[PDB]
Amino acid sequence: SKISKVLVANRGEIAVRVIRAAKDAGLASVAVYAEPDADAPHVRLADEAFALGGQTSAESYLVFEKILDAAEKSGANAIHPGYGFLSENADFAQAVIDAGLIWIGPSPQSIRDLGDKVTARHIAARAKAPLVPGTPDPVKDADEVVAFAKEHGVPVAIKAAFGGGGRGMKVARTLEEIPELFESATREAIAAFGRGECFVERYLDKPRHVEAQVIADQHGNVVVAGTRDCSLQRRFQKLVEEAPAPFLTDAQRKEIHESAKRICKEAGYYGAGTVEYLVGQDGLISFLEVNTRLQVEHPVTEETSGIDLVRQQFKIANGEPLDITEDPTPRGHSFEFRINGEDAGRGFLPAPGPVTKFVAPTGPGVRMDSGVETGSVIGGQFDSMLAKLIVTGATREEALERSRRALAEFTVEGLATVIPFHRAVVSDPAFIGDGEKFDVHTRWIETEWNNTVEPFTGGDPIEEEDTVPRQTVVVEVGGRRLEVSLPGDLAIGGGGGAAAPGVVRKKPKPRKRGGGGAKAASGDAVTAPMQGTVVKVAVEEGQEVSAGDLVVVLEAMKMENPVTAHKDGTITGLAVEAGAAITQGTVIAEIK
Amino acid sequence: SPIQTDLLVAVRDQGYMFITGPDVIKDVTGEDVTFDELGGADEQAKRGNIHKVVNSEAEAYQYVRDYLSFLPSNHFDNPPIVNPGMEPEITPHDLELDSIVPDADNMAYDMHEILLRIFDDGDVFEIAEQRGPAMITAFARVDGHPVGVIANQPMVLSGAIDNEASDKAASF
Amino acid sequence: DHEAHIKVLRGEPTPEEMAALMAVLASAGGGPAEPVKKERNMWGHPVDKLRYSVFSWQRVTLLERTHMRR
Ligand SMILES: Nc1ncnc2c1ncn2[C@@H]1O[C@H](COP(=O)(O)OP(=O)(O)OP(=O)(O)O)[C@@H](O)[C@H]1O
Ligand SMILES: *C(=O)CCCC[C@@H]1SC[C@@H]2NC(=O)N[C@@H]21
Ligand SMILES: [Mg+2]
Secondary structure, X not given: OOOOEEEEOOOHHXXXXXXXXXXXXXXXXXXXXXXXXXXXXXXXXXXXXXXXXXXXHHHHOOOHHHHHHHHHHHOOXXXXXXXXXXXXXXXXXXHHHHOOOEEOXXXXXXXXXXXXXXXXXXXXXHOOOOOOOEOOOOOOOHHHHHHHHHHHOOOEEXXXXXXXXXXXXXXXXXXXXHHHHHHHHHHHHHHHHXXXXXXXXXXXXXXXXXXXXXXXXXXXXXXXXXXXXXXEEOOOOEEXXXXXXXXOOHHHHHHHHHHHHHHHHHHOOOEEEEEEEEEOOOOOEEEEEEEOOOOOXXXXXXXXXXXXXXXXXXXXXXXXXXXXOOOOOOOOEEEEEEEEOEEHHHOOEEOOEEOOEEEOOOOOOEEEEEOOXXXXXXXXXXXXXXXXXXXXXXXXXXXXXXXXXXXXXXXXXXXXXXXXXXXXXXXXXXXXXOOOOOOOOOOHHXXXXXXXXXXXXXXXXXXXXXXXXXXXXXXXXXXXXXXXXXXXXXXXXXXXXXXXXXXXOOOOOOOOOOOOOOOOOOOOEEEOOOOEEEEEEOOOOOOEEOOOOEEEEEEEOOEEEEEEOOOOEEEEOOOOOOOOEEOOOEEEEEEO | OHHHOOOOEEEOOOOOOOOOOHHHHHHXXXXXXXXXXXXXXXXXXXXXXXXXXXXXXXHHHHHHHHHHOOOOOOXXXXXXXXXXXXXXXXXXXXXXXXXXXXXXXXXXXXOHHHHOOOOOOOOOEEEOOOOOOOEEEEEEEEOOEEEEEEEEOOXXXXXXXXXXXXXXXXXX | OOOOOOEEEEOOOOXXXXXHXXXXXXXXXXXXXXXXXXXXXXXXXXXXXXXXXXXXXXXXXXXXXXXXXX
């Protein structure tokens, strides 16, 4: 069968991307949106749209029945999962196939095999990919970890067999931390993924993250569209990415290409995917994992190789052989910057808010993939990304120059973003390099970057002078254009004035609690500090707790925030359960 | 004399108020009672005889200055106007209010999350916080002009109006 | 220093141009701009021309208050 109508089971910039690809290919597009996304750009861009209902992802986009019912009612015959959500759920892939639909992605068996990290390591070893030393099977007890660590010398890392998103890895510097770290990792894996299994391996001191884009075919063909460098990471999640991977010897580049092809063929992988490696300061390459979906970074490879990877996914799903027979030769250099709704001046903590203004750059070598526009609203439910800015040039230096220009032009108002960090990094010498190497690494941002970004405040008046009204006027002085901001109470030339009748000005007070030393201890109520979803309740009615004890965990922007008891006493009046949406100031319980 | 005044601010472990002392009470009726029970700062604040309890005399003075900054000198004169004309257009703080009330009816919430957004700034100056905790009486400013605010506090006793809440609202 | 100043948000004037601009603005200044010299004169005030019912609450809230505001 051939794709005729594609249902995009996702949201935001990726949904818009798949819709545009389907439009190019001539196919019909169905979008599925939750209530918070009732007017997102993809809903209006798609040929038709269906309302899943609900507010959280766990009840709108992560429901097989809702997505499949949308497919049935829209008449769609293919389903594209984008990335995230169900794009790597083998059970969902199998359900899609069983329903008689074309699942645009790898096979369920491939998804399971390459999601099980220990099984992935077995496949890589069988394919003879370069691997960092480590226990080939999950450990039994901290004694095994200590035996490995003593044999191989610290540093070391303990990783869950099914963890992901950067949460499933813990690090040990000294042998004393091995037992406690192992216990913590085991309990965290049990709680979060169900599979309480972990292994250990050597920890690279300052690795680079280099990955290879693979176009794989149902007929057995495999092509490597090109490499990428995503060393700039925040919390083991990428922020800035490059293509092709810079400053690699031909030996390294060839090894990455060949090992990627071998791994895909061993796994039986077909469809677009990526093989992620790590390059240590010593220069050695090590296989890290295989992403079985379209990766967020694909635009840089598209720009540098001229391949439309989403349309390649469509062709592979239709079952045709690849039209590409050899690895493309990269042309130029492309950078990609994620426009997250995160404040770099506040530890990159994401926060919702309105998009009161969104003016993307244009011009030479600039591409914008945005799921946001002026007047959009970012709620607390979904990931914090707003858009992706891709800047391409004839070489790395030209790409950096164009990136400086484009980031200077890019403007967003109403909420915080990481544009100030992008603007700083694209000129930081540690990222420019010396023509043969560069100093960044997977922990460079959080431990080496000089964070000079100020906290976001918007237009809120903070100082006494901020209260005075102002008017901006264009002036010309001998032709030169100027913009002058004039206060409403200005007095110059021995005259002028305003607000005569008993007006006083003082520092405005923040829209926060009164700042009493009790730190909310003046009351018994535990209040939700932000809008979010209760994902875990750590106490029970009548439970006695002490100050600092965990009460609940609230998920906002897909990030977890613990809410803890502020005073000793008995928990009472628990009004929340797992999965309940909660607003700021909502009473969770009372410590009476 | 103090009970006739409009505001009573007491230092916590230092200011007491009572008609009769515990010794005389013991002599006449035989009851045993301490000063804290018979007219400590917090006890009187909860009963409504004291509008504010502070920890120190400097805090008392600052409370008095803040309280007077919202009021005219007398019944006839105007009050001071403070920072008129801030933020004349909808702000993200205003837009946060569209989703502040819980979805479920039985859920309680902190009314300060609304009071800190519907006036000029976070300068909501509360009076008699302890008397009726289900009711909030405070001063605020709209466009620089002082206003009194009587609000329900769902976070406390479901926001029901009890005896102390009713009297606090009436007096205010 | 909490004074509200003049900001040149965009542009970079040379000292001569800044001098010219500031001179023009100071000349354009509003002069005395409602000085404090205002004196009270309640003679023939409109409130005193109104008919009030012998029991009108406006005798307190309009007439008395107008005569007493300072
Ligand atoms: N052995 C190691 N030594 C040093 N750093 C490591 C090691 N393993 C992982 N890391 C760092 O931790 C990050 C974890 O990435 P990993 O691909 O394992 O997880 P993930 O992105 O959450 O997984 P998934 O894509 O399967 O959901 C790596 O990108 C790298 O930054
Ligand atoms: C909801 O927003 C779905 C997840 C969107 C982000 C996904 S998660 C997995 C990929 N890795 C990453 O950094 N972003 C992608
Ligand atoms: Mg990964």
